[PDB]
Design a protein around this ligand. Structure first.
Ligand SMILES: CC1(C)C(N)=Nc2cc(OCCCN3Cc4ccc(OCCc5cn(CC(=O)N6CCC(CCN7CCCC7)CC6)nn5)cc4C3)c(OCC3CC3)cc21
Length: 194
């Protein structure tokens, strides 16, 4: 029943005439308002990336990898402000952020973003919670073109956060991160829509 979404993939990646690097990951989603755009979680890397696979010249040798193995309660986390600790070099540190949603295909994972890096991250937050590294704090425009200017940077609104309807995901044409914005906050004050 799977085509590309839900599959593990491998491909090469090449910027300029630089070296080709090999990447392995899991395709999380094909974006409804832009079916060319796939969201990808690369093994060992924590951000969610968007690539327009069918036209990005930097992608080479795309292949589907076989699954090596066959394929609730923590829903209460969704929408919660959190403090997420991590090991630095010894010292431990923390970023504060917001749990956005459960991740699409990798069941036990969660979308999360942070004030110090307001792009889309993905973590096994229930594990982190059990290890004492996640403190829980006490408690449309999709498909529209967006620009901000800070040269004229253009993109598209690809998702609205169900748990927090003023929060949206934006894919800018010039980058492969997924940007998260709360449209009522200062971080969004230079975004304009069409
Ligand atoms: C142990 C584990 C898992 C757990 N169980 N829980 C956690 C929790 C962690 O923290 C939670 C808070 C959020 N954290 C903190 C934090 C602090 C510093 C950070 O620094 C990043 C600086 C950096 C990184 N790059 C690389 C880069 O940009 N690339 C370009 C794009 C490339 C892919 C796309 N391409 C490929 C081809 C197609 C396009 C990849 C390379 N460049 N600069 C980042 C963070 C995130 C946690 O954090 C990580 C550890 C270091 C602190 C770990 C865990």
């Amino acid at each position: 029943r799977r085509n590309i979404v839900g599959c593990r993939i491998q491909h090469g990646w090449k910027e300029g005439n630089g070296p080709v690097t090999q990447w392995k990951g899991t395709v999380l989603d094909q974006v409804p308002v832009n079916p060319s755009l796939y969201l990808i979680k690369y093994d060992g890397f924590d951000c969610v990336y968007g690539l327009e696979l069918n036209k990005d010249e930097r992608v080479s040798a795309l292949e589907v990898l076989p699954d090596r193995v066959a394929t609730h309660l923590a829903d209460t986390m969704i929408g919660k402000a959190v403090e997420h600790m991590f090991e630095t070099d010894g010292s431990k540190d923390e970023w504060r952020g917001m749990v956005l949603a459960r991740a699409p295909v990798m069941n036990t994972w969660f979308y999360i973003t942070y004030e110090k890096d307001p792009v889309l991250y993905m973590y096994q937050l229930l594990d982190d919670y059990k290890e004492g590294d996640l403190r829980i704090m006490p408690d449309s425009l999709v498909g529209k073109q967006v620009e901000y200017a800070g040269s004229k940077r253009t993109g598209m609104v690809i998702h609205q956060v169900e748990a927090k309807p003023s929060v949206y995901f934006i894919k800018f044409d010039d980058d492969f991160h997924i940007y998260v914005y709360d449209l009522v906050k200062t971080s969004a004050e230079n975004l304009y829509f069409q």
